[PDB]
């Protein structure tokens, strides 16, 4: 489609695809573009149909210690627990992202346990400054995710807002 045929090289401080009902192969395309073009600082793909395959593509192209990216916004995306584990894994290796915004993304106890664990001070990230989580559907009385987040808060010394 139109999205997949974008080819640019210069500048690209930010990219804003507000909703545009992005498919997941389109997410593959944008990850491929940003991999082969290490120039960008902000990526915004709110409200799409991006599934765990595009999530995996973006996360793995970001997990490289080169081609830095600073702000990653993905809201209203059924990214699930597999996607949450992929993003926690990639954060475990990344050093350039400072804002991780995962809101309205269907995260469960498993995925958000993984996220909370991936930022404990020794093995975590000094990089992230803004961790935005929302709609963590712990409808059941799940009393362990908050303990893991408490451990995050006790060890980490770089966050500023949550």
């Amino acid at each position: 489609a139109l999205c997949e045929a974008l080819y640019e090289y210069s500048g690209l401080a930010v990219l804003r695809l507000p909703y545009n009902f992005l498919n997941d192969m389109a997410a593959q395309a944008v990850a491929r573009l940003m991999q082969v073009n290490p120039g960008l600082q902000l990526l915004d793909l709110t409200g799409n149909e991006v599934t765990d395959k595009g999530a995996a593509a973006i996360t793995e192209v970001l997990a490289k210690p080169e081609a830095g990216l600073k702000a990653l916004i993905l809201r209203h995306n059924p990214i699930g627990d597999t996607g949450a584990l992929a993003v926690a894994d990639m954060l475990r290796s990344n050093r350039s992202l400072t804002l991780l915004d995962l809101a309205d993304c269907h995260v469960a106890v498993k995925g958000l346990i993984g996220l909370a664990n991936a930022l404990t001070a020794p093995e975590g990230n000094r990089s992230l400054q803004v961790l935005d989580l929302e709609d963590a559907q712990l409808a059941a009385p799940q009393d362990s995710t908050y303990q893991h987040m408490s451990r995050m808060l006790a060890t980490n010394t770089t966050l500023t807002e949550l």
């Binding site: 106890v109 498993k110 346990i113 993984g114 664990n117 404990t120 059941a140 799940q142 362990s144 995710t145 893991h148």
Partner: protein, 51 residues
Amino acid sequence: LEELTDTVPEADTSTQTDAFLDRPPTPLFVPQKTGTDAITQIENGDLFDFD
């Protein structure tokens, strides 16, 4: 020949549980949809009020 002190065996060792295998077990449940859902709206000209 041997003359050695009692309680010969000795070894220090540490242990740590995994921080990711600590989550509670999944709930053994699966809901059943009760009935079929509905699609409804009116569009241009679905009822003409002559007044």
